[PDB]
Amino acid sequence: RVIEVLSRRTKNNPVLIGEPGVGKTAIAEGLAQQIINNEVPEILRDKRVMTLEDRLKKVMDEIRQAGNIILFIDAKPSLARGELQCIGATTLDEYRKYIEKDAALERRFQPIQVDQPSVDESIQILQGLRDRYEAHHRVSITDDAIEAAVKLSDRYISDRFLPDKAIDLID
Amino acid sequence: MFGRFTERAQKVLALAQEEALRLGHNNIGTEHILLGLVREGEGIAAKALQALGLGSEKIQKEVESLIGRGQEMSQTIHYTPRAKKVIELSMDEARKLGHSYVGTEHILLGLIREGEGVAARVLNNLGVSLNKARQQVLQLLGSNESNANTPTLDSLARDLTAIAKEDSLDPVIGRSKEIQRVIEVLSRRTKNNPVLIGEPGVGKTAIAEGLAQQIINNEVPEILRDKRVMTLDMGEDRLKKVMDEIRQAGNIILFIDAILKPSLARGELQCIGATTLDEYRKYIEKDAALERRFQPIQVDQPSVDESIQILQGLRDRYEAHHRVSITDDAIEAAVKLSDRYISDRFLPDKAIDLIDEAGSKVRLRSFTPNLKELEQKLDEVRKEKDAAVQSQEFEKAASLRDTEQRLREQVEDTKKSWKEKQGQEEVTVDDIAMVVSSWTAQTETDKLLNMENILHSRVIGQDEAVVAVAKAVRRARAGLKDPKRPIGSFIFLGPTGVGKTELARALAESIFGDEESMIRIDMSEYMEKHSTSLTEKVRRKPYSVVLLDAIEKAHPDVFNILLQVLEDGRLTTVDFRNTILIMTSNVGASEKDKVMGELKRAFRPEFINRIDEIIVFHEKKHLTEIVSLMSDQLTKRLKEQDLSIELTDAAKAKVAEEGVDLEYGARPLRRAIQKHVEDRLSEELLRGNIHKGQHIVLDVEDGEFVVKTTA
């Protein structure tokens, strides 16, 4: 759904609204993965996705002069003075802190939500970073250990997002 | 290839292959791409080489002097990884030239850039350094083509007169009599500067491009010829700087959609403003250089048909996302559904949004067989091959490699079998009506003809009432009643808990799609001269059963209001023409004739007479039929949690026993189901008697409940 929008000519630039995280940063690491290997469409090849004041609009001119580039944002608009393809980091409400003063929103920028990742998908998400937290001594393993983290959260408080919570618990 | 280039390109590329084999080699490297270019002898690339002193003669001699024959293998060959880079590059050596499409030059450009390789050496061998070469190609391509415009045209900010000069500008429709009203407000001396207010929405910004075209050629006062339209706006260090570099140049008109930053009227600083219905309220409210200088005109939500035309004009331009032009029959839906069906924008933005929702979505259903599995397989291979190769295991790979490519070509052959998922993937309506329902004809009038069957399955008893409503809705819904008035105005008389509300739900569900699209006010709240409604909830969902309970309580004031609703289906300024108004009351209650009497005496007649219709609301085996309905809703929601349960008919009987007492009715059944079923199954699962995911039956034995297992 980041791609129906990132093609348009209408509500062109997609804004990624969902309760914070993780997942969110993982969706753009998606396009990245998708354009490259490789199935994608309405003109989108050789396109980078890039991320994260006395250096401001400085670098931004290397773009009004070559345009293979989506910008990935975290937190502002130096504005659709032209190109500028960007994916939105913002909250259920935080986005209503753009379209009210309007109306670059209902125009350029345009939204989509992060459902909380699939419970089972939730599980096989840790195992990937299981290896990498093995950094503190215990995990890798146990699988029977993660099953916990994830299921506990989805119904037993239960006031976050179904992929972010679990991870915290491990820690 | 790897995309699309000129013939010349495409010919020169395949031409490398021609040379691939003519020498018998097996991979076409950068050296063949080069032979490809000098051997089509007519491309710009070809032309250049003729310059440096490099005919096909001189080159191929160096090449054969570094490779020669000639394993005729020709086992369906592929590229060098270098050369695949070389192609990826020409694509970029043309982004870098505005050349919308690659061609003979760019590929020669692309070679130099990735100089590591065989071509490069042919030449550093033929005494032709790499740069002397990129030069020759360059010196065979080039370019293409008022003072104050400098500071200005600089910023910022899109010179509309400009985009309207080379005629590189869309129509655009109109709002043609709208464009004109701007030029009065602009040819003046009083209200010098115009300001458009409407939902934002109607791409107000569209009307502005209107001047560009007309000021040019040319219908406009000699009072305005020789001027320029430009844009932005709002509000940084580039302050009064460029604005000084404009007052010093009178030929300028400007466009905004934001703040004030008003140095108004001062210079020839002349504007055109686009700001919301209200936001303007919040600027002449500033006053009074506002009410003075700048000055407004009403932007219309385009005539529905006009909408359609706008779409097409830019249809050919949304072919960008790969599916349009057409279908017309589809456009009409994009548009038409929005004017009447949700129903929360301007009639030209809405459209295009439906189109774009779909203006990738289908190009996508393209990109989604289970041959996801093949690639999965091929992987395990490389490894064996690869890791084996690290152990060697050599001939243990030879065949391993071969086993690999066996796979690959198979993959790519069915990965390009989905050019068929391309020749397959439309537009028609059904696409849209989806989009619509996801924003809120046989089995649509069948809901109507068969309404009674439908309302009956939810509302029990009460056939007197159902048929009256069915027919009334069907009257209005068929063209007979006046459209500005609600779909239906009813009064529901009768005792409590008979079906008054229940029918209102079933109506919402059947008519509006959602058993929950129902506003419900309690007139107990409106008994005093404080009778100020409601209109919020109706603005919220303007398509909903509006249910006012117990109207006998309202201050007769209220009726003056409702009356206005019944008459005009409008308040002042909400809209009801799409509601189904239902007002309940106890006026009959205690008590069809003695009743209609107590009604005429309780309500002003002016009122009773504008109401479409006055509706009157008048076993063990049913209880257990209910218990079963409930029990089934349950056994389904458990199957989801890997729990398989079943009640015997004997068991549903025993639950039903618990709603016989005429006094409390069938309320108790929900609770008694959770107690005798839910609570008991838990206690039974926890105590360890039922190893979940076996099949669990609830039965009655000696007049007592019993749990049984039968996996």
Curated annotation (Swiss-Prot), chain A:
Question: Mind telling me which residue stretches traverse the membrane in this protein?
Answer: none
Which positions bind ATP? G18, E19, P20, G21, V22, G23, K24, T25
Region I, as annotated, extends over 1-171
Protein's job: Competence gene repressor; required for cell growth at high temperature. Negative regulator of comK expression. May interact with MecA to negatively regulate comK.
The record's similarity note reads: Belongs to the ClpA/ClpB family. ClpC subfamily.
Q: What is this protein called?
A: Negative regulator of genetic competence ClpC/MecB
Originating species: Bacillus subtilis (strain 168)
The part of the entire sequence present here spans 191 to 396 of 810
